[PDB]
From a paper:
Structurally, UdgX is highly similar to family-4 UDGs (F4-UDGs). Our earlier studies allowed us to propose a reaction mechanism of UdgX, which involves the formation of a covalent bond between H109 of UdgX with the C1′ position of the target deoxyribose sugar concurrently with the uracil excision from this site in DNA.
Substitutions of His109 in MsmUdgX with Ser, Gly, Ala, Gln, Cys and Lys showed the loss of its covalent complex formation with DNA but gained canonical UDG activities. However, H109 substitutions by Gln or Lys, showed poor activity. As anticipated, we note a clear difference in the sizes of the active site cavities in the various mutants. It suggested that the initial increase in UDG activity (H109K to H109Q to H109G) occurred because of the efficiency with which the water molecule could be localized to make a nucleophilic attack on the C1′ position. However, a further increase in the cavity size (H109S to H109C to H109A) perhaps destabilizes the bound water, thereby decreasing the UDG activity.
Author numbering: 2 to 208
């Protein structure tokens, strides 16, 4: 059942994170430095979920510490959301990567659907533990983990969604991943930043 047996029977986030350090639910634990669990407390009303820890996250032991995390910090501030009141995590908790000759960083490789399904028990334990009012899904992998493998982030922008098989029926808001707004023509990046702010504001408004 993937990571299921590695998940202990607790809602204590420090205990879950320690256990995630021992997970072998898929092959990704082998080459990753460490498991990167979510950060934040169980009082959090807003949960945010990216794809996976990237290069910086793999070594920091924390989510959203890179350029993508800093852009998200700028978006959250513009949306009047405090990052300390958020629970932030990723669909899979081990960095999947390769290197290219001459590169300046390790390159993220897309988790397969199998890896996403294997690791989802941790996501479920996190949601059980935090009981968020709203889940922001940042990018396609995270959105598909909860909304199904055919889901298209691009076709449901700014929509409050609810699926039946999700812990605590929280509202779900699927949006672009902060990494997508780092490059491109200035006017498209600025339009996209506004869209992300809008989606974050939709999520924060959820009753
Ligand atoms: S990615 Fe998830 S399921 Fe795979 S080894 Fe890491 S914690 Fe376990």
């Amino acid at each position: 059942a993937g990571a299921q047996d590695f998940v202990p029977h607790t809602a204590d986030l420090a205990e879950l994170a320690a256990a995630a350090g021992e997970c072998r639910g898929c092959g990704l634990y082998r080459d990753a430095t460490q498991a990167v669990f979510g950060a934040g407390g169980r009082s959090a009303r807003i949960m945010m979920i990216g794809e996976q820890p990237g290069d910086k996250e793999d070594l920091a032991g924390l989510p959203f510490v890179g350029p993508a995390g800093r852009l998200l910090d700028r978006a959250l501030e513009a949306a009047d959301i405090d990052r300390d009141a958020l629970y932030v995590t990723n669909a899979v908790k081990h960095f999947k990567f390769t290197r290219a000759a001459g590169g300046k960083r390790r390159i993220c490789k897309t988790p397969s659907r199998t890896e996403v399904v294997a690791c989802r028990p941790w996501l479920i334990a996190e949601m059980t533990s935090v009981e968020p009012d709203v889940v922001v899904l940042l990018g396609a992998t995270a959105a598909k983990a909860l909304l199904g493998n055919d889901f298209r982030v691009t076709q449901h922008r700014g929509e409050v969604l609810h699926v039946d098989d999700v812990p605590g029926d929280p509202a779900l808001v699927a949006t672009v991943h902060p990494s997508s707004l780092l490059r491109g023509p200035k006017e498209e990046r600025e339009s996209a930043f506004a869209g992300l702010v809008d989606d974050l504001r939709v999520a924060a408004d959820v009753r």
